[PDB]
Design a protein around this nucleic acid. Sequence first.
DNA 1: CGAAAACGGCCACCA
DNA 2: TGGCCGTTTTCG
Lengths: 221, 221
Amino acid sequence: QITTGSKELDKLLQGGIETGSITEMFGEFRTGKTQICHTLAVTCQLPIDRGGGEGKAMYIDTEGTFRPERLLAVAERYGLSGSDVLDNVAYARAFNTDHQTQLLYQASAMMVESRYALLIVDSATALYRTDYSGRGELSARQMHLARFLRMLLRLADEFGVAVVITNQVVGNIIAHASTTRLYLRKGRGETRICKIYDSPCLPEAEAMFAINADGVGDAKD
Amino acid sequence: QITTGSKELDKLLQGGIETGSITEMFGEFRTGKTQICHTLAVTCQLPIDRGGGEGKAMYIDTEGTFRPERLLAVAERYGLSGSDVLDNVAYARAFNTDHQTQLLYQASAMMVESRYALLIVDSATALYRTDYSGRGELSARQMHLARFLRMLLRLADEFGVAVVITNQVVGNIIAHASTTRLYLRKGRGETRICKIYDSPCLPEAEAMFAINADGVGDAKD
DNA sequence: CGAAAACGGCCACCA
DNA sequence: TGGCCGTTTTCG
């Protein structure tokens, strides 16, 4: 179980993400999906006794929001070497849906030589909206997304890593494929509300957390 | 009669599913169809005196929602070996309608060597909607579904096992073929309402049940 | 004959 | 209602 670094969120998840499965967090923009991704990108490298996976991180960005400085902040919060964190995070920006899936081909071969624990795909659904904008082409983007999700599940079962994808809510296919769906909504200021909206094992429940300069971290009224 | 593991639902069914016949549960998404399937996948292995069938389980998944951990939770609830439960559940994900029917060919030969009591097909109608999306191809998916249902009835009469298929309600052919139709709807929180909408023997009636971490289990206000 | 435009008709979404 | 395409006519 990879620690989220929010204790309340860890309790909500019973200790953190299950490696080897896809966890989807759907919420409005600015809810902190990207911030949680940046935090996990570092916490994954933490020792297992500290809630990490003792593995490198993979950040596939489609939205430009990748900040190595956020990774440095998370590393210094938990006392990890920021330089080693950036050395254990491989980053690449996907320009389109086809490029987004093509990067998985390099990811599968690269993930064999080194132990990874986390795969991050940020604005995973944005490129299927910007690229495929027509109505007759909807089935094509749905097929590409389906294949992409199957590839995610395959890599998860192959390397035993956690698969994190982010969705902006301004597909029903992900429900059966994703094991845990988390709904994120803004509480005013920088403090966010998290809700579980389906889990066969986890209750439907809510937990409050905040977005702090160092971290994605528990709410401290 | 295979125990549902909800006492109120067992009373609704007069003790549980009749083996050798198809029981259809149609309801909205998140009503708990999959949860009931996971529970039954373990309860089938229970002794007959405990409401089981003393047989192995078969889970054909089309939606990715298969969770061995849910099976482990159901096994520990009723005190069954979780490892033996997973050893008595054969699992396979159908990628399309043709693959969904093709898996029945392996199922028929495999079900001869060992005693099974339950066959689960989850999102059974989803692949006929994702694969066959056009309007001119509707008769083709209806024919494939008809043949699939006939194969289900044949296997039910051959092995005396319970046939469970799940349908998302966002065909009229199943009515004559399915013996008991159950309508599932959400009560808020995790507690679900079950209604019988046709049975020649069972009354039209309703029963309240809940979805608990261990189990599909009676409502406990 | 044919550019071009002016109309007409047809479709998309979901209401 | 907006867009696109078939057409029709109109003017050179």
